[PDB]
Amino acid sequence: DSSYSIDVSADSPDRYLLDHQVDGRELFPACGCLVLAWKTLAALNGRDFEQMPVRLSRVEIHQAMFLPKSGSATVTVSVMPRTGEFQVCENENLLASGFVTCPDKDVLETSTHAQTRSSLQDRPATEVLTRDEVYRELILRGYEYGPYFQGILRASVDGQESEITWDGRWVSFMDSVLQMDILARPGDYQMLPIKFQSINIDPRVQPAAPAEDEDVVVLPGRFDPVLDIVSAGGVEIRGLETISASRRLTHAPEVVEEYRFVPHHTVDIREYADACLAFAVQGIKKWLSEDKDKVLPQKDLLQDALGLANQDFISAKAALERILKQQHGFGLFHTLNLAFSEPLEIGFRETLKNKIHHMRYDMWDDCLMSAVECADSLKLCIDTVAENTTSHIVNVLEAGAAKGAFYRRAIPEALAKFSGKDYRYTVGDASPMDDAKEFSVKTLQFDAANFPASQAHAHDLLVLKWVLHQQEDLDAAMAGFCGFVRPGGFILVQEFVHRLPTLLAVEAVTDHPLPRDRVLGRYYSAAQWRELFRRHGLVEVIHRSDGALADMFLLRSRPPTVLHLDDLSCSWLEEVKAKYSDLEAMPQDARLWLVGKSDCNGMLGFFNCLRQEPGSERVRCVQVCGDSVPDLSPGSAEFKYLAEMDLAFNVHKDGKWGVYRHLAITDDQRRQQFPTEHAFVDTLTSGDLSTLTWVRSPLNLHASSEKGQDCELCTVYMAGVVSRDLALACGKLRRDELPAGMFCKEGTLGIEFSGRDTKGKRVMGLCAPPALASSVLCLRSSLWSVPQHWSLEEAATVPVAYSTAYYALVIRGHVRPGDTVLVHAGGSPVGQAAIAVAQSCGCEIFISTATDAETSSLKSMFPRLKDRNFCSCKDASFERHVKKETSGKGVDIILNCTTGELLGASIRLLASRGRFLNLAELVFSGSGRRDTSFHDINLDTLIDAQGPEWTELTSLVQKGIQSGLVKPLARTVYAMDRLVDVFKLLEEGAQAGKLLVKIREEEAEKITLPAKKTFEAVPRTFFHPAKSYVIVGGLGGFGLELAHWMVLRGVRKLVLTSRNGITTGYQTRKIAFLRSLGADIVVCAVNVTSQAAADRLVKTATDLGPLGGVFNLGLNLRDALLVEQTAENYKQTLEAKIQTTSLLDGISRSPKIQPTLDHFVMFSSLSAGHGIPGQTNYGWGNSYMDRLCEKRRAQGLPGLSIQWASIADVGFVGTKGNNVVIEGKWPQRMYNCLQVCDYFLSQNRPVVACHVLAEK
């Protein structure tokens, strides 16, 4: 137990160990455990770990320790003297094991140690990867190494020849070599090493450690793929079996949101409101009729309310009870019932008020009170305020916080999503507000006019939720509120207009009494509210209603210079550049009126970026879209109406004035299952059985034609489920473990199926994985015709069951007349199939049922079975029974299906020349029966590799079907929408025989067309393999990864267009990999700027195949403030987005390509939505692209514009470090970006956005 205490403090040597990060976690590298075992062996043998050649074999990695951010950890090492079986473990959980020894000269076997010349230099840059790209690949996979572990200086495109930087530390060097190995196997899944085969270290031949001044040593390293052996300097790693991992998003969830032009102006909420009004009216009538003790608070007020409403308790109570019954959250009625029905004796006020205070928490979340404060309206109001205040911090004050509790929904749904505009929010009310502790805010207690002068004019947004109908002197209270607001600030008001008597019942208790325009002495109408706002220097900028109770208003405290940027050739650039400095010298009461009315006027993004720059505060943008162009000439009624508000972002559309704002997309909308003609079940979050759901299938795209062999598309009617499907869905069996040919498939669940083939003839059989689906593309060789007298509910049981039975007993077991067959778990369908086959051959069968009901059922299903041929599988008793009944010889064919100690017991029953058919081996190898045989039976491999054996098996099962041998087993049909329960039951072990899923009900006729049907399924994104897609500028950083994802999703014909073509080595490696996946990548270098260039591009695409999509990913970054912006920069930036986009749009809507195009996509950036300082070219380009895509969708044809915040890894930000924050937007990962893109490609919205917020 040579314990090692590692330390990771600042001054400790091992600080570098914190550089080995894997998805934002400081994992202790396996190389560390290897080096620790090396040192332990060296110490135990009286040697130094720098001059002792070592060899670690059979190494296996169990767990990965998480290094503390700062502190120390303990790891023990326990090696055996003779065998050298080390065991590196910490605390109670083992980390790694294997054997470690010290061999003689015969330690290294590669000869790369002797080699000293590199030769990697003087090779064209197009054929060598530098450190930056070599580690860009690995960070893309998920390994994010720090500078100390970035121990690779150069690599070849083949990934074979490479250069390592030796600088003393052994762990860094070993992890560099392992990084070489990982680089040798491309992909997109976070590979995790588990088992090695041989790690030989020979420090003697290794070059000596550099001194401090001798910089580093460059060591050559080579990876031989024949044996899969990576050797650099003095190390030699071999084997490296690996598994997959499910990644771990390092940041907060991506905030998907759709751009939309938001204009200014459960139970049916109106019905709820009306019913509650009637209930309140009758309850007030009851109270007035039962007011003999004169205890009713302000009886005159409630009499007035009842009289105004006028203009049985059981009846209305039943009305509201029924309306509740037919139906989330119902608060108003519950509180009203509590209030009306309560002992009204002396002291009523305080007890009832305390009860109402208890219930206020539920009262907030009511489907009538919270009917107007939907996420949409709050986000609209808050973002309007945010983009109309010139400051990095926005102040918000909430008066009467206790009554309203606005923050409840304004902080976590409209403020917490702020990016680049910090929010300072404070509450105020005479009552304590400790309940606001969770939502961190500063408490400024007060209430009226005795208004704190400390915040005299230091607020931008004042919140008035149900606090405007409580004051008496509305004029003075308004004067105080308006004072509370900075000039140009906003006020949020939420009031009641209709159905006042209801909730007046409540206010008469909980609210302060008031005397008595004044509707009920306390309330004002909508028009009256607007009059009140008008009288007090306030213009209502937004008005939202709910039609029942509540109305929200966002109000603002009230020689123009127009500048029509109608031109799109950047003459406006010079015009505005000259006219915009004139604002600075001008007084602060004058603003610049930028007016844009063009076919695709792009001012939205341009101004969004320009706003950040200094001196832009007094600049107003006016975007005009659509016809009915408003009169924007100076002196026009529209212009007076606009200046009455003076809003930064004002847009016109459909004849109404609104604002182009972002709106969040709730998870209820990211899983809206749509109807599709084909679908297959899959697990969204791999490893969880609670997420199984139906996803659209690529067959819907008429991709049913398979190049290999001839295939037939069958319409499934009854899809079976096997233990294999559970093993895959749960996560016990990783996808990559499946045979090549099933890993590239669409899904991986379900094999058996049965239904009508083309022309309708009923068939059944196994197939590729995507069988548990509403349609399957079988290979025409795995199809048996359903006989008569066999309804499809029964044919779903023969396959897999009898297939495995025959394949085990006959094809491989070769059971003969005689011999003894031990069938474990005779209850399961495979057990019964094996019983049938074995009894057909005539052998003696020893069954091992688990329970007793299974024994009775089997005995009643098979007459010839006696009572001596049964055992108990649950416990290790079957061994005794089998050995006693068979005279100790032992059985011959053990169709075993158990594991663990039961497996050892089963192995200890096998007789000489015995065949152990393991359906699920380590113990077996140590057998003592001499001539034996062990057969691993995995039907998946046979299904994939349909050699002669598959045809022979098909023939055997068909011949059996012709006879009476095979017959359907016990079946348990489960409805379609019961996948989670079906899989859970399959996990439990209480499965009743077989398990099926009824996709479609069988019809009377025995041969007919399968009719039509639509299935609910979450839409995925798949591409037609016979089409061609162009990725303009796809050769950059994002483009390449988008192309790899595309090729994974089915694209086989690509045109990666770039400026100069292939320049670096990373592009060449990516091209080679994509072509290795079996795709046609015709890289061009056509800078699309004229009709001829685009025509040539389309000619290339068509020569590849019919054109289907165009993913424009080009960009040009000439960042510079508008005060010092040159026409050349604008031209160079727009020709990358505007010219190319316009030409592609013009050429893709021609008659010859329009009916074949479905994926016109333009990658944009948020710089058009949220602005970036001094990047107006990017903003104008992005705005134009978004407007073009909106026009496209309005006109038909596909259209899409995805606005990104910041992509990590690939971009230059990834090279400098994927942590730099811009406007508070963390650099988004890649795979998360790809998943968001996957959702975005298959949803009908013109322009969308996606950004990841950074920890403030």
- CA dist 1241 and 1250 (Å) reads 13
Cα 15–chain centre separation: 34
- CA dist 1177 and 33 (Å) reads 53
**DSSP letter string, 1053-1083:** EEEEE-SS---SHHHHHHHHHHHHTS-EE--
- CA dist 887 and 860 (Å) reads 27
Q: How was this structure determined?
A: cryo-EM
- CA dist 679 and 122 (Å) reads 54
Q: How far is CA 497 from CA 190, 520, 843, 934, in A?
A: 58, 11, 88, 83
- CA dist 197 and 57 (Å) reads 5
Per 3-state DSSP, the chain is made up of helix, strand and coil in percentages (nearest 5) of 35, 20, 45
* Cβ atoms of 622 and 650 closer than 8 Å: yes
- CA dist 1134 and 1119 (Å) reads 13
CA 1208-1214-1217 angle, to 5 degrees, is 120
* Cβ atoms of 1114 and 1033 closer than 8 Å: yes
**DSSP letter string, 621-654:** EEEE-SSS----STT-HHHHHHHTT--SEEEEET
Place of tokens 């007016």: 595
Treating both helix axes as pointing N-terminal to C-terminal, what angle do 723-730 and 979-988 enclose, rounded to 10 degrees?
100
Read off the tokens for 526: 């909508």
Question: Edge-to-edge strand order for the sheet containing 932-936?
Answer: 870-872, 844-849, 820-824, 891-895, 910-918, 932-936
Q: Which residues contact 59 (CB under 8 A, 6 or more apart)?
A: 34, 96, 97, 98, 99, 195, 196, 197, 199
CA 1118-1058-1111 angle, to 5 degrees, is 90
* Cβ atoms of 141 and 200 closer than 8 Å: no
Report the 10 Å Cβ neighbour count for 1244.
8
Residue in 351, 338, 143 with CA at minimum distance from that of residue 248? 143
- CA dist 429 and 941 (Å) reads 72
Burial (CB count within 10 angstroms: exposed 0-12, middle 13-18, buried 19+), residue 859? middle
* Cβ atoms of 397 and 462 closer than 8 Å: yes
Question: Edge-to-edge strand order for the sheet containing 784-785?
Answer: 776-778, 712-716, 753-756, 762-765, 784-785
Amino acid identity of 88? V
Residue in 709, 678, 888, 681 with CA at minimum distance from that of residue 783? 709
Strands 85-90 and 72-77: antiparallel
- CA dist 331 and 364 (Å) reads 8
Read off the tokens for 368: 């009538």
- CA dist 478 and 471 (Å) reads 9
Phi, psi of 1117 (to 5 degrees): -115, 85
Residue in 484, 462, 475, 408 with CA at minimum distance from that of residue 439? 408
- CA dist 316 and 277 (Å) reads 10
- CA dist 783 and 40 (Å) reads 60
Residue in 1068, 1085, 1106, 1240 with CA at minimum distance from that of residue 1164? 1240
Q: How far is CA 846 from CA 158, 823, 824, 894, 1122, in A?
A: 57, 6, 8, 9, 88
Alpha-carbon torsion (764, 768, 772, 776), positive or negative: negative
Q: For residue 287, what is the DSSP state?
A: H
Amino acid identity of 1013? K
Helix (H), strand (E) at residue 780: none
To one decimal place, what's the resolution in Å?
A: 3.5
Burial (CB count within 10 angstroms: exposed 0-12, middle 13-18, buried 19+), residue 211? exposed
- CA dist 1029 and 1043 (Å) reads 10
* Cβ atoms of 616 and 1172 closer than 8 Å: no
- CA dist 801 and 779 (Å) reads 20
Residue 232, classed as helix, strand or coil, is strand
Span between the terminal Cα atoms of the chain, in Å: 46
* Cβ atoms of 79 and 87 closer than 8 Å: yes
Residue in 578, 579, 530 with CA at minimum distance from that of residue 555? 530
- CA dist 1256 and 1254 (Å) reads 6
* Cβ atoms of 95 and 63 closer than 8 Å: yes
- CA dist 630 and 616 (Å) reads 25
Strands 784-785 and 762-765: antiparallel
Report the 10 Å Cβ neighbour count for 189.
17
- CA dist 177 and 112 (Å) reads 13
